[PDB]
Amino acid sequence: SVAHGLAWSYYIGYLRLILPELQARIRTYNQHYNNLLRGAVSQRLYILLPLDCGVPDNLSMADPNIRFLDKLPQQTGDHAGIKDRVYSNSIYELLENGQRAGTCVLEYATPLQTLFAMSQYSQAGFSREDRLEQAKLFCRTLEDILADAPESQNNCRLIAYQEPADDSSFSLSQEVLRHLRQEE
Template structure:
């Protein structure tokens, strides 16, 4: 992981991807159990026999669980598995893996000398009974953390789909054309957006997902100035479908205007609407988690897109419980001022680029996350 990614993931707002600590911990516990068995000085044959019996019982329990699941899936074979029963059965349990393990354990048990005690069939029946009771009472259900990890590893989250849809259906279309649109706009509005380093789309990502259709309703210090020229493309059967972005002016404490192209990330509206609809079964906590994952996924997607490089800036913030009615404008200005402070030297080198409140160049696009402190550095460590 690069230092830039470390700075991004280090922020408390956005969770980093899960690692392999659970697997490493299992290795440590296996070694600890082996050490305990060694110190107890039990007969190796007896320990091996008990181990095989319990291992076989676990596999049989998994088979029983798969069979119970199959009794439900068999009613959906036509709709979910195209009428293929074997495919439905394979979705419920791994026949090859479980079958092979059972054969190996059975062969190993037959090679071990038999000891007095309960018959093998009775031992397996008792252990399997315990496994089935655990299934019935839900003791083997995955935890919330396991479900979350499974969804993240397999990209099954709502946020993942929304981020890709937002990128493919919108950002990938407008960002490569954004600078051309701003160039045309600047020819008729030469007092605005003078420095080319500011020619990017500033995307607002509120973690509470409250998105306003008009930015001035969120903050009266944000004023609409004009729209950029429309981008027209043929899209999904729609001839000359149009896309456009808006230039807004941000007033500071001295009533000076700072101009930039800024808008909300529209998929957040879907997350907010889902949390307000009971039929979606989507809680506020789910919304917050998915908003964070949306932010992380979008940053990862855009970070790998050469077409969109240098054309965007993500501004993530959390204004829940914030009483300042001008919080959003101050948040945007704080980032813009940070850019002006760090990139002013580069801006001066550009021909005809004069330092004004409207000139805030940025060399590298980086995710900016506010936590009531100064914004993160915009300098790239790779330069």
């Protein structure tokens, strides 16, 4: 299936490459680049899995209570004949009642944008119904892989979520914080 392929691609070409080095990058940040006066960046990559595959490029905007602080130091490697391919991750602050309640490495799972685009382009032959189904299958497949992965499950948290189309005003920062605080 499409989701099976994207989930393995996301593991093989990214997660298994970055997650075993992520701890050291975050420690290195917290010791040398982090504001002296602020809380340490939490450990683990937090991965946002919107099942409707709505993935903005600006996470900082879009949500008032989630703001970009800084980048982790880059990770570089040679991959597929590209010298020094760069993998970068961004640090965000999470707000609760107008003040910082948490700080973490946070991003959307990029392959969900692929499922979104594919539902948009006619040549892909991929419907909006297929997209939801493939989204859930992506997340499941990804959870199964991470469950027996050495490149651990324990350096990331998957945050899957649905926003109501019946409109009950969803809170993304509270979702992260919920996951963040399970780790405290």
